[PDB]
Write a protein that binds this ligand. Structure first.
Ligand SMILES: [Cl-]
Ligand SMILES: [Cl-]
Ligand SMILES: [Cl-]
Ligand SMILES: [Cl-]
Ligand SMILES: [Cl-]
Ligand SMILES: [Cl-]
Ligand SMILES: [Cl-]
Ligand SMILES: [Cl-]
Ligand SMILES: [Cl-]
Ligand SMILES: [Cl-]
Ligand SMILES: [Cl-]
Lengths: 202, 202, 202, 202, 201, 202, 202, 202
């Protein structure tokens, strides 16, 4: 009876000390996605709780923190695959950085002296236009759709030198209205409601 | 029967357009936690995915992207509660920025000229000591434990201009060895395995 | 125990002899929908097995048989509500009557002499143009979408003298790619993937 | 992980465009059955939702619409099996066409003028006898039972040129009192409650 | 302690129901068939401890049925009797003449065979009586299990050994549907022919 | 799918007409047991619903009806095994035939002229003493226990000319206090509550 | 969200520190019973996992350790009820102290210098006859049944000064053959398989 | 069928008379653990009740009764494995023998005269310090933690001449705050909340 107990204790030790012992996540996967509450990421990727490192922010956009996190998981925690997942009805496609900056300026905030990263004072902007850009709203970045942002994020990570390129990278769009992924720019909803010449079953 | 169908259609319409219509998440909650695969945050808070905007990065540390994200959720998306959740066996407590810096430098990386935020060129460091600091490992920030990091995060968020002062902020530490939250510095294990004078039952 | 047995047998008798005893379906409902295997109609309407009379044909289009069936359920079996449900990727929006007629003529069908209703010889056509229109493909009827066809079906039934004025009628479109209904012409999939000004959460 | 996601996206595209791509239902099966609420057809045939095209009308009787729908499903959508399912306590075996006509005539209807198919004006009758016959009640057709009607349907479809002769056609009767099919004319209930010579077990 | 003691008394009562004068949970006695397809408790919607269930070949009223029914009603407090015949009954597939000859072929002498070893007083003294003893439906003039259920109800209703206060009802177990029906009330035929229906108002 | 339906209907037909077609019960078994409500016979024998013919009377005692029934199942319905099951706290071991006789005499019953078997007039007793024996109470038959009665039942059936000699016969006693069978005269309850010299485990 | 968490931590703290904080078991119960593997005590007593302090030894016999443990649970941990459960087929009723003492002596054990309690050297015997008594076999204590032993245990604990007088004490016997309790010396089994005059149901 | 019944009666007879027949528990296992209500021992060892003899007292401490019981289970009942399981928040680590003795002495108890083992007069202490020592509180025995007590108990049993050499002995500590066993002095909880140099995943 004791040999099973000993076995299960060692298993529990490995799980509790993965980052000490150099054990990766179960699918060696890292996911860049959205903090949005409707983006239920795990079921749409077909993954289990311990399968991936899931990074989440406003819009699922590549920030310095996204790169910081991506660079550690890949280089140090054995991640070999990245999946970028933007989503539909994203808040970053509902406002602009100009509106947001003016909103804060009207409450007394001063973009030039606001401490954007208290733990890293080296990061300053010294411009109101850089403060607008910092929020990373779609229209300010010149992006029209989450599909375009998914591919854009894939490209940024693909070209960045902090990531090793044995790593495979792919981008998808989460559809909040159907809780399902699509490939960027592959929309079948217009095609199914129009005439289209079908073929006879062989 | 059609009226049941009509109300359910309006229900799913609002769900798909929450961000246009000004509908918050179900608990008006925002969580700052870790990307670690063993941190099953929803289960440990007793919530469903639709209840919160969950921000996740390497370490559950307050970054500019965390502040960016938290600032938008609180001011524009109606979030009134923030919960910071660090975790045990955090990868950020297993290495130093000095180790990580020398690793990348050994692969030909140049700290001063690497684009840390490609979409925000204004993000620049011009120093190796700043590059080491940018990774935000615990020891380099002077933090000894996830408990201390949970309390540090809450304190920064509480004193930040971009976050409303009426937002309720709280800290916890996710224990990967038990899949359970604890309050910072309130660890039940040590106390139960030593002598402590008991009380006679009344 | 005998009293319980007897009341369950009465219950069985009424269910087995609803049509003899003048008992309607559980929701006094009649559905016109499509035979398509992807149209799972009951779950999309939010009803149970015994709730409705469900009429199904090629395309969910109003035919004489549909009118015959609706006429009997409304006037004699006590149905007070009608729902019409067309669907996406319908076979009737994928070919033309020209195609189908040409195919059948090549296999030896005589448009004028073929028995369209073997049990009712009074139904005759005497033209190849009538044979094409009889198949009721969308393009031949001048209908551009399932949304348009759902509304057309509602109107025809709404204005037909064999269907009582007191019967309430509504139309919907079944989406095969989401297994869910929509109101005709209410498409949000374009709106969710492009910019649209949002409102701040109150 | 992405490969299995891409594999699932392709599969869902095929499902949404079956009629474009020339993909049949999962059984190549077509069912002519009744609209009656007590006829739970899929349960009785032991089939899953995507298995068959299911036509449903008043009585599960072969009409022009059923033939129309059967001709398309077999020739164009690759259906290789037809099953005709009538049912017990069918409303078409509870009334006559004469009753129904007199009822409608008393409410100002004129058999010769009423448009039986608004989308096909070429369908005219020019007689009250044809109008009475159009309702397809069992009595006016000389059909005594759902058993006899199921076989009549099978016969009609077997010898119709719009349905390919290599399609297998079978008939059954749905018993609403048992929620179970039976073969036509093979009713076990009489046989078990009379005297009948048995055989000794060896 | 007190809840264990209460449970101990409950188990004692259960173990000694016949000593203490405790009836079954429904005061019910069921006369039914031995057939393996007659799952009687399920069909009556009853739990195991609800009824005394008498079972024989055919669910036919015999001296043993009257004996058993007499004790359950008068001494064990049964107030309800349910008689349940069934479809495809073996007693409706053969006759006593067939079965008699079969045993005669195997060298059994109807007059000599001891029908109740524990009761020598039961003698028949005729070959016809031996045939009637098997109680096949034909030899009793019964066409259906419906008729046999009604006949069994009628016999028990009129018998002086069974209290007149007791409720007696008959049913027919349908093996093809695992369900009961009322005698002579068969829905299966009525649903498959023309019947003047009524319009819903 | 017709082949499947046909195959299931045949399986129903054989089950419904077992006694016509000459099909035995599943384990070719007949059981003589008691009508007592506490004797849950099937689960105590370890059998399923369709496994056995179960005969039940007042006391699990061999009577003419038990012999009649057992002769038919063995000779005609293919039963090759018999199991007799008496039980603890049997009502037949709780009263006497003399007591029951007196009770009925007080209600005005005439032992000479009571139709003991209405369907068989040839059964008569012509004695007060035979009326007492007819009830078959344990005391009157000279039976000490249910153990003795189970073995006495086995003997009677084993020596009876109407029951085939190759039929296997075994006796048991159902313990109502523990819902479990025992072999006759195997009482271990005394043995477990007193001293008995055990042996060292090898 | 943070309120349910704090509340669940409080409950976790109380549970983990019941002995420090002076919380009793859920029913204020202490059980003296046997180590035997067939004695499933909690289910026989009808109690839950956190209801009782369960003391278990060889035989369920009152030893110094039982008194030690009983006096602490009652005086300091708030236990107000005691239940003694001996069992049938107890190993202490299958052997004698003499043969066991002889067994150990044959292995080279020296009764007068064997440390019976290494943590308490004050416990000495200095006699082979004391060694025999120390094992506490039923025959050496003059106890003939588990029923007598249960009552003896109750009486010893009832008169002991280290056990409070307001504590309620009750004795039972666990039947390993039935997995069930009985009152001492009340055997149902002998009464059920014998004749006994019953009563008519009123 | 009787074949299965006779086989199951043999199994139950063996089960009821294991001590007579010389049949061990299912795993030949003896457990020394605590009477604490929170210690759910069988689920933590992955065993069923029939798998082991479980000794339980205040503390899970090796008393004379523990040795008595262990010597019988090992030598006579075939036990080949011993498992010692102390626990966290143990009452024996919450008070002292001095306090307990004082409590009893003030209530009128005379240490030297009280019968510590009524059935064994040979057990005498003749000292107040021995009375304090008799309770076996951790502090008096010089034991720091349940971990230390688990190893102590294992060592005492392993060196005792009444327990065979070949019996395998192992110690664990049950954590009430996680219902989980750990190896003595192998605590992951402290290691996971402080810095420790990790290794890069290969
Ligand atoms: Cl987002
Ligand atoms: Cl992390
Ligand atoms: Cl269709
Ligand atoms: Cl119908
Ligand atoms: Cl197709
Ligand atoms: Cl039968
Ligand atoms: Cl034999
Ligand atoms: Cl024991
Ligand atoms: Cl020694
Ligand atoms: Cl000596
Ligand atoms: Cl304890």
């Amino acid at each position: 009876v004791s040999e099973y107990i000993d076995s299960e204790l060692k298993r529990l030790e490995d799980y509790a000390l993965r980052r000490v012992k150099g054990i990766p996540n179960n699918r060696r996967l890292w996911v860049l996605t959205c903090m949005d509450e409707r983006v239920h990421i795990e079921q749409s990727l077909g993954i289990q709780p311990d399968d991936a490192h899931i990074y989440r922010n406003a819009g699922g956009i590549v920030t310095d923190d996204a790169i910081r996190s991506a660079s550690l998981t890949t280089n140090f925690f054995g991640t070999k695959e990245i999946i970028v997942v933007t989503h539909t009805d994203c808040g970053m496609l509902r406002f602009t950085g100009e509106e947001v900056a003016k909103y804060f300026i009207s409450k007394g905030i001063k973009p030039t002296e606001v401490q954007l990263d208290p733990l890293l004072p080296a990061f300053r902007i010294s411009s109101e236009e850089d403060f607008i850009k910092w929020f990373k709203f779609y229209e300010d970045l010149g992006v029209k759709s989450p599909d375009e942002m998914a591919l854009k994020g894939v490209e940024i990570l693909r070209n960045h030198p902090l990531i090793p390129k044995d790593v495979r990278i792919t981008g998808y769009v989460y559809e909040v209205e159907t809780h399902r992924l699509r490939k960027p720019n592959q929309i079948i909803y217009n095609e199914t409601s129009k005439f289209e010449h079908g073929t006879i079953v062989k």
